[PDB]
Design a protein around this ligand. Structure first.
Ligand SMILES: NCCC[C@H](NC(=O)CCC(=O)O)C(=O)O
Ligand SMILES: NCCC[C@H](NC(=O)CCC(=O)O)C(=O)O
Ligand SMILES: [K+]
Ligand SMILES: [K+]
Lengths: 439, 439
């Protein structure tokens, strides 16, 4: 089995609305001008570079945006364009909420269970409700349709609907998930990280804890994860209060390694010890606050890196350009590179558009371990290669603007462009009529 | 046009699970033995008694409980009886959450807009998401089906689906709604009360504010309420922090009267002044903390009373027994009764089972103003009369238990009793296959 990366193709309504309290990047860049075309191309370049380097790469399409059905649910009626106009004038803030390209961060799309960890031997995917943020909670229904259109062989894949939409069951998916072990194909140890749980007072006081333990346990159940291969750990409330809104902003796993900050978890010593006694050859690379502060981790996203495995067993860290621009962080990463451990190469990518909204390399990808047989069962139209890379770039040049602001979301033209764009894209990716506007 | 009262028929799984933080009665009675059959009878006696007194009355049935579909959505699979078992053994607390008789409090089923207040001249009903509490949020889908089976004539009734299930749009329906004006059939002034709103620092700090202004404004749009007959007002946060989880625990309206506690609203003086200027004949009856403390207000449910109009214009207060059993409150009520004002009669009902979970006379009913023609359009099988009364009592005698504890919710027998009872009830009330288990 190999770990295949599925990246989100940035949607054409990508803009900065500062909709995520707790996500300092989102808040900080509120109202800045975005570049949808550049954002999409930046992500496609990373996808292609990794694919050309031999790492299985795939793509997940953007959603229908602006999403008029939700506006109708909010009390606005008439034709699509009439609704758009009514809202732009009466409640413009709702326009932004239904026009976010947020589904691009597929690390939040679902939680994956490789067939080696499940009871029925199938690959399980449970859609994340993303209930904490309204603009993201809207994603689940379409994300479910997309996942079923991509992992469409029901004999090999089981897609489960998102958990009930309530704070008690807040779920953010793979971004709070981890998998440790030997080769990807062997049964692994799944680590679910949460920010709060009922009956526990240890919880953030400034920024919200989007993930609840209750949600994580339900996901573990849905994905039929062997109860002996599961472990739940609470994120350090202090780091969440400093900007770590998902575990992937403070820690990342791969094979036998867990690269994390010293302040990542609550009861960190106990967790590492438990993992040490349950995962053969487990190695924890812990970054001390003296070399990298929590504040520096949040601004650089060094932990939102992709930790890849090369054929020699050595690893490569995929990082956002901000890690190279911060003296202290670039210095540490190179110390790590030279240090005696699995990390033997650093790879940097420019994902400025995504980072401006709090999403780095890892946020843009969803890791799915697949056996040779299961890989062939995936919709081949979404697997990255020269043909898809060129087709997607041409598609982006045809429909994306190199400039967008919240004010442009009221442009009925943008609406029109987006519909046609997604119509063609669903054809290119052999997804069928997966979008609501297509039914 | 007349105001018709639709009451909730208590479900067979009525039990105390302390599931509602902020609802002190619920919290106070956690795990006490309940009496489903008695709870049902108490409610029907109030329905029948008001009907006999000349007040149009109707009924809304309970829901499917335990609700197995939600448990499966939570990860527990297998046949109905296997899920029940697994849950009881693995996570029994979920059993209570999916077995609550909470839909009985129909004051939270939806928000109503009579035809005299709407832009298209129809009766509008928008289902409440009840997003704040997980066990009640589960109600919306079935509540919508029930409302559509009762107000089926689409030329006269417009039922709208519940708002998106997110905290930003928390909606608790009619319990936070008010309608003032001359006669019921005349255009009235709708007063929407909310607990919080984005950007507003004024909010409760102890108990949650379940209703947001954003939701209120969205429902006003969905119900097509004439913009000049709508007013939004914030609940006094300090009273929410004392147990007023809904507006109907601190204030109640009827015709030109607004019976409320002095500490009910923020900027109350100005709110009442605005009402006096915009509502002809408006009369506020404020109870000062000196005469009735907020604590005694929440313990007796003085304001969760039903304020009814007598044929001669005078009014009657339908109260729960606690009001008569509390010397101080009973004293005030009698002073109010004697004093020169519209309140000329007091009527008390034993609703101990409902009150133990924080529901009084008003909580158990949903006010729906209907013209003669609209009244004729309502499903006739749900209107209260001797036939229906005797039929429902026999039904209760045949399927309801006299005792119930949380531990009993795991009994596959209870599941069967309920499914069968509802199947029979659907026929009696002529609702067709309205429940999920019937589909
Ligand atoms: N894994 C990274 C997710 C980033 C995402 N940002 C946003 O939704 C910001 C959108 C805006 O503010 O325009 C979030 O907060 O979940
Ligand atoms: N309008 C009053 C409704 C009372 C209801 N009680 C409850 O759901 C308590 C159920 C329990 O805790 O078993 C509520 O809190 O909304
Ligand atoms: K190294
Ligand atoms: K009086």
């Amino acid at each position: 089995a190999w770990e295949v990366n599925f990246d989100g193709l940035v949607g054409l309504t990508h803009h900065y609305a500062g909709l995520s309290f707790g996500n300092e990047a989102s808040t900080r860049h509120r109202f800045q001008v975005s570049n949808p075309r550049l954002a999409a191309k930046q992500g496609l370049l990373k996808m292609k570079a990794l694919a050309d380097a031999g790492f299985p790469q795939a793509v997940i399409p953007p959603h229908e945006r602006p999403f008029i059905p939700v506006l109708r649910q909010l009390g606005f009626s008439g034709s699509d364009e009439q609704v758009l106009e009514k809202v732009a004038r009466q409640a413009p803030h709702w326009l932004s909420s239904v026009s976010s390209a947020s589904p691009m961060w597929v690390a939040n799309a679902a939680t994956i269970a490789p067939s080696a960890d499940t009871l029925d031997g199938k690959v399980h995917l449970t859609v994340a409700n993303l209930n904490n943020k309204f603009h993201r909670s809207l994603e689940a229904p379409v994300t479910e349709s997309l996942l079923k259109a991509i992992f469409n062989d029901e004999e090999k894949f089981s897609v489960h609907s998102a958990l009930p939409q309530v704070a008690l069951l807040g779920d953010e998916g793979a971004a709070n998930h981890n998998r440790l072990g030997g080769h990807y194909g062997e049964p692994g140890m799944q680590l679910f990280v949460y920010g709060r749980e009922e009956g526990n007072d240890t919880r953030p006081s400034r920024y919200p804890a989007r993930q609840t333990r209750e949600a994580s346990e339900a996901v573990a159940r849905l994905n039929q994860v062997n109860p002996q291969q599961v472990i739940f750990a609470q994120q350090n409330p202090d780091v969440i209060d400093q900007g770590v809104f998902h575990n992937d902003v403070i820690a990342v796993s791969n094979r036998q390694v867990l690269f994390c900050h010293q302040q990542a978890f609550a009861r960190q010593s106990q967790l590492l010890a438990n993992l040490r006694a349950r995962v053969n050859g487990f190695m924890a690379i812990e970054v001390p606050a003296t070399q990298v502060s929590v504040s520096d981790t949040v601004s650089t996203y060094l932990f939102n890196s992709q930790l890849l495995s090369r054929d020699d067993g050595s690893m490569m860290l995929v990082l956002p350009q901000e890690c190279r621009e911060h003296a202290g962080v670039w210095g540490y990463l190179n110390e790590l590179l030279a240090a005696d451990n699995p990390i033997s190469e650093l790879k940097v990518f420019d994902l400025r558009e995504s980072m401006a909204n709090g999403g780095g390399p890892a946020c843009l990808r969803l890791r799915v371990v697949l056996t040779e047989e299961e890989r062939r069962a995936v919709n081949p139209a979404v697997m990255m290669n020269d043909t898809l890379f060129n087709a997607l770039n041409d598609w982006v040049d045809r429909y994306y603007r190199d400039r967008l602001t919240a004010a442009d979301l009221a442009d009925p033209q943008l609406l029109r462009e987006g519909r046609e764009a997604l119509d063609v894209l669903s054809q290119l990716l052999n997804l069928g009529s997966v979008y609501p506007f297509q039914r």
